[PDB]
Amino acid sequence: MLTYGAPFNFPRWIDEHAHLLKPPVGNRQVWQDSDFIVTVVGGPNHRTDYHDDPLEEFFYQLRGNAYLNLWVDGRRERADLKEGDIFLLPPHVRHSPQRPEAGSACLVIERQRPAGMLDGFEWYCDACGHLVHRVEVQLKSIVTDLPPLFESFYASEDKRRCPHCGQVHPGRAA
Ligand SMILES: [Fe+2]
Ligand SMILES: [Fe+2]
């Protein structure tokens, strides 16, 4: 049967979930227990962590504008997600999404990761660019598997300390 239910109007769904598409929640997954992880991400939200996804990520910036801070070819780059833009991110490209605008909405589509295929989350030194800390996770649920990871980095000067220049990373806000 239709495990994930009947078709429904997407703009209306987004409107009805507007209260979840802003802090502190910020995002909302559309269907549960599906292979395709379909999420709408709102704003505002700024962050310092970079994601290393072992699979591809599809973006369609439906409302408002956002941007991804990236590492490409060993250098810091920015991919703008202007309203109306689509984008396909290859596996393992490190990315830190920034969503400055309230009322923005981005469709993000990913795949469930098989057992053994791990996600990485990491931070880089603002002073010398060296990797400061990386955690790998078997990502089953973003809601329980991810916030403690971030929280543990912010709470530890050891985790935040650059091994190259010794600068302590700011933590939650750059
Ligand atoms: Fe990601
Ligand atoms: Fe450093």
From Swiss-Prot:
Substrate binds at E57, R99, E110. It catalyses: 3-hydroxyanthranilate + O2 = (2Z,4Z)-2-amino-3-carboxymuconate 6-semialdehyde. GO terms for molecular function: 3-hydroxyanthranilate 3,4-dioxygenase activity; ferrous iron binding. Fe cation 2 binds at C125, C128, C162, C165. Keywords: Dioxygenase, Iron, Metal-binding, Oxidoreductase, Plasmid, Pyridine nucleotide biosynthesis. Binds 2 Fe(2+) ions per subunit. Pathway: Cofactor biosynthesis; NAD(+) biosynthesis; quinolinate from L-kynurenine: step 3/3. CDD domains: cupin_HAO. Inhibited by 4-chloro-3-hydroxyanthranilate. Mechanism of inactivation involves the oxidation of the catalytic active site Fe(2+) to the catalytically inactive Fe(3+) oxidation state, superoxide production, and formation of two disulfide bonds between Cys-125 and Cys-128, and Cys-162 and Cys-165. Enzyme can be reactivated under reducing conditions. O2 binds at R47. Its cofactor is Fe(2+). SUPFAM superfamilies: RmlC-like cupins. The keyword Metal-binding applies. The keyword Oxidoreductase applies. Homodimer. HAMAP family: 3_HAO (MF_00825). Belongs to the 3-HAO family. This is 3-hydroxyanthranilate 3,4-dioxygenase. It comes from Cupriavidus metallidurans (strain ATCC 43123 / DSM 2839 / NBRC 102507 / CH34).
